[PDB]
């Protein structure tokens, strides 16, 4: 019955979620639950790896020009508050890839290519790209582009995850309309807030990166649309958030 | 024929880079009018979401202490964790799942931070952590629109390292632990350690953290152990020493 | 020489080359690595480097100063050259540590890829457990440690450890082609990219878009750039000089 609970197989532990009523959403008591077996995982040197898993079918669900001008309009030296979403239509090659780059949410039309040319012209691709393509997919397939300047395919662009979506040709905006609709059906203080979490955090020190996100999720947590959030789910009615 | 036309439907604005007798090659008077769209775009409370596309073919050829280390907030564990995802994995459940080190996934599981759609943020370390652990692009998805990924999209874009039949999640996590078990404790602990310590922080700072961690485990009985368990062709005898 | 060295114009090609012992990492080898990488970074007529093994593996395993070793493993030492990676099979240990250091990947269909270390009390401590989860997804990341246990060449393509997966004994000729298209390219261009590249690592995006541009400035002021322009106005190859 605890919402815990706590197995010994010689050198595992298993930890099971355990809410069924709840489909495993983490509580108070579970969390606590959860430091002790932490504490007890640590301290037991013949425990040798931990298994977490959910009661039943659920795992946990779970709550409970100027230099001004340019670096700006490249989204260079500016970061957009809002959420920007890629439709990318066709060939995005050298500044268009660049600007990906500072785009959030990206979907690809089939016929699409991806590339950064700038070294078979004895240039570089310097408007962030050599700071930012491995950051955002895997390191050697950076390298390659930038320094092969070779493009992708959109399928190999979906695989390498520098776009989250290959859909059918001439669909591309569509599919960016339909994202944008969920976007703006979400609470916008709570929206710029998390981009601009995951924006500023970076890939830095990660408990100077939890100080800059903790920065930014105190105001939601005490903003009117939070308790609209909850208040809405329900008074059995929509949402109506204002950004504060 | 504005070099880059601005639309816009109510909260959402459309930006069209508009040259396409050169594919929409960026512009001097293009980049200064992006400039302007992302100032109207941040100023005006009532565009919550930007679209970018291209005209015609081309797009632009150019006890506080207990809640954060229950959740794994302000505290990693010195061993090995595997999820075992049997299922839907939604909100404070994939928050503590990147922690969590090795990862497998039901087939009917599902992975989402929906915390947006309620007007909440997760802030249980996901905006720090998302973006390190799958690529960037799915992570700002996955917490600005709030939608779930299926596990064949988990997979894909490496939020988790197995897919597997219903019901068999625990079973697989288990053959992994198995494994596990059978490694150096020490060097098991040890190279976990380094592997979050380094973070992605300067090289120089996190080779130094490394070297730190993997002096002892060089030195240590049981790397002899194991060297001579592999050449002698019999299972190594751990200790942790 | 277990390690070696043989050119082919602007292209040097590095072959691991103890078969018998899978090509294992030995003392004099990565003493022959740690020459090798100097005299490629002194060469300015070597444009780019590759780096495979002799035989049906790739690398498998594994008296010297401190400072010989970490500059033949790369660990201590980051080449100003491009770097492909031929995995014709077997990348395990010390080898997929070095893999971390090269830039380009090729495996063949049936190399596999892994670090089994800790199923011997060891660690893969030569910067493995810095780099990995920084190019491959963390969870993979960590299991590869943790487990020791290897990809096939498709999971490591699925992952992004590798670039590309191609047909059995054919990742040296792909190797090859990949070079010639670098060589082509300007190579000022090339090695200020790659500086870039790593020097701006995950750093915080103000200082390492300040590390970009000032490695940007000499490239955009050059005498290739110019030539790349007109050769690309032209409708010709560029001969590009480095300048």
Known sequence: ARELLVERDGPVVILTMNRPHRRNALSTNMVSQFAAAWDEIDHDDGIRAAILTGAGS?????????????????????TLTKPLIAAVNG???????????????????????????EVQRGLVPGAGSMVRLKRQIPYTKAMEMILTG????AFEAYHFGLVGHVVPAGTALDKARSLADRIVRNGPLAVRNAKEAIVRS????????????????RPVITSADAREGLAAFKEKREARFTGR
């Open 150 to 153: 070779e493009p992708l395919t």
């Open 58 to 78: 659920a795992y946990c669900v779970g709550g409970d020009l100027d230099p001004a001008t340019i670096g700006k309009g490249l989204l260079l030296s500016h």
């Open 202 to 217: 970076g890939w830095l020190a990660e408990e100077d990166a939890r100080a800059i996100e903790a920065r930014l999720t």
């Open 91 to 117: 060939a995005c090659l050298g500044g268009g890839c660049e600007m990906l780059q500072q785009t959030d949410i990206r979907v690809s039309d089939e016929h699409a290519t991806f590339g950064l040319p």
